[PDB]
Every structure is written in C-alpha cells, then in structure tokens.
C-alpha cells in the first residue's frame, strides 16, 4: 500500500462538508460566473474558456512543460477546453478532437473561440478502439474519478496504453496526458516503461483539486516518477485539515475569430 492509497482512504472518510473544504483548499480556481451563464444561454461568440481544463493546459504550456504544435489530436475532448486552447496557439495547424459523449458525458461546446475553424470535432467516438493516425502532438485528458482506487488505476492504465499506441504510430510526437491515479502499482509500471522508451515525466498543476491525485505526464519534462508521485501524495495528505479557501483567478479568454 502507498501513500496515495492512504490519501484515497482518508478522502473517502471525509464528511460532505470536510470534502468540500478539502477539495478547494489552497488551489487556484478560475472565476467562471460570466462564462457559465454565457454557455447556459447558448452564446456562441465567446472566447472565455468552455471548461476548467483550458487554464490547466495553458499553465502547462506557459511553464514550458508541453509543446503544442502542428497537427494536434485531443483524445477525450469533452466540452473542448484543451481543443480550443490548442487551436488558439499559432504553432498549431489543426486539431482533431474526439469524445464519446452519451449519457452522463460532456459533448463539445460549440463557440467561436480563436481558431475554432481549425478544430474537427467527432463526438460518439471511443478513442480506446480507434486506430491512431499521424499527429505531431497527442493530448489526452481522460480519467473519470471513482471512490474505488483500483478502478481509477485501471482507467489510468488504459490511458497509458492508448498513449503507447499513438506513440507507436507517431514515435516523434509530443505527448501530454492525464494520469488519474499515479500511485497505483500497474500505473507506476506502465509509466516507467513509457518513460524508458519516450522520456518525459510528471507534474502537478495548481488548478487540480485536492480531491484528485491527477498528475500530467509530458514528454517535454523529466524526473523520477516514484519520487514525483510520493511528493504529491505527501502534500495531499498534509492538506487534510486545512481550512483556507481557494485562490480565485480570472478565467482565460482566448478571444474569438478564425485562423
Ligand atoms: C471532462 S474531459 C477532460 C476535459 C477537457 N480536457 C476540457 O478541457 O474540457 C474527459 C472526457 O473524455 C471523455 N471520455 C472518457 N472515455 C472516453 C473514451 N473511451 N473515448 C472518448 N472519450 C472518452 C469523457 O466523456 C470526458 O468528457
């Protein structure tokens, strides 16, 4: 058993109020009041982020931890926060975005955020059975939370396998992907094998809630995986009991228009 496994057990033992206070304490949170109502009313001429994912990917890019360029694939795009972010980057030439949709899952939000015309959305697509194709940058933000850490480990393992399949097709592609449960043993093993062949490492974004252990793997960084994970587990465990709130920051606005 790992520190991350203990984190999960402590998290599941929180009351609803303890959980609400814990998940937000000390995290950066974009202010989505305006964005939420625009989307609800169906305004399509907006460049405000369609989801909380845009600022996470922007932080990775702005830190230099990811390289977004060329033909981009967004595997599991949901509302499209990463696809709209990528499409606004001048180095990006096109985005092919795929998501399953269906009951209980987010369909792409349709807006004129800068570069929207360079995105091809396909909803109703399962990426785990879809043949890879050529790409310069592969992105995947898949990983559904569950109270069962073993289920989260298996979901994470499937994402890493998908990445391996896209790297087999595109050995030179940049990769950035969510690792939902990085402390599980089959995840550590798969990440070690991925790093052995492709390089890369893990990083925690400051927008991730304390109620998720998610870390982002990118081929553009480095670092010992086990140490990266354990440092993060210890940080999450120490935050139980903290009552400070989140740090509110403005939401990203990419502007509107075609590229
Ligand atoms: C909520 S998103 C990540 C958020 C996104 N990066 C953003 O910025 O808006 C992950 C998405 O992957 C989708 N998904 C999960 N499994 C999938 C699969 N096997 N094939 C395609 N999409 C999947 C989920 O429905 C979910 O919408």
TrEMBL record:
S-adenosyl-L-methionine binds at residues 51, 81-82, 105-106, 126-127. GMP binds at residues 8, 16, 23. It is found in: Host cytoplasm, Host perinuclear region; Host endoplasmic reticulum membrane; Host nucleus; Secreted. GTP 2 binds at residues 11-12, 14, 19, 23, 209, 211. Mg(2+) binds at residue 145. GTP 1 binds at residues 8, 12, 16, 23, 145. S-adenosyl-L-homocysteine binds at residues 51, 81-82, 105, 126-127. Induces the formation of ER-derived membrane vesicles where the viral replication takes place. Inhibits interferon (IFN)-induced host STAT1 phosphorylation and nuclear translocation, thereby preventing the establishment of cellular antiviral state by blocking the IFN-alpha/beta pathway. Inhibits STAT2 translocation in the nucleus after IFN-alpha treatment. Forms a heterodimer with serine protease NS3. May form homooligomers. This is Genome polyprotein. The chain holds residues 2518 to 2775 of 3414 of the full protein.
């Amino acid at each position: 058993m790992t520190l991350g496994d203990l984190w999960k057990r402590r998290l599941n033992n929180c009351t609803k109020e303890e959980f609400f206070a814990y998940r937000r304490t000390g995290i950066l949170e974009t202010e989505r009041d305006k964005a939420r109502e625009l989307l609800r009313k169906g305004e399509t001429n907006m460049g405000l982020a369609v989801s909380r994912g845009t600022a996470k990917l922007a932080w990775l890019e702005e830190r230099g931890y990811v390289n977004l360029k060329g033909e981009v694939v967004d595997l599991g795009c949901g509302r499209g926060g990463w696809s709209y972010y990528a499409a606004s980057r001048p180095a990006v030439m096109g985005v092919k975005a795929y998501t399953i949709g269906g009951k209980g899952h987010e369909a792409p939000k349709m807006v004129t955020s800068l570069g929207w015309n360079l995105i091809k959305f396909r909803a109703g697509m399962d990426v785990f059975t879809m043949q890879p194709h050529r790409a310069d940058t592969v992105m995947c933000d898949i990983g559904e939370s569950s109270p069962d850490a073993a289920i989260e480990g298996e979901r994470t393992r499937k994402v890493i396998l998908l990445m391996e399949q896209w790297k087999n097709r595109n050995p030179s592609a940049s990769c950035v992907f969510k690792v939902l449960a990085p402390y599980r043993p089959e995840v550590i093993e798969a990440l070690h094998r991925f790093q052995l062949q492709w390089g890369g490492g893990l990083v925690r974004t400051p927008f991730s809630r304390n109620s998720t252990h998610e870390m982002y793997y990118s081929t553009a960084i480095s670092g010992n995986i086990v140490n990266s994970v354990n440092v993060q587990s210890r940080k999450l465990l120490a935050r139980f009991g903290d009552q400070r709130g989140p740090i509110r920051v403005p939401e990203m606005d990419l502007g509107v228009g075609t590229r």
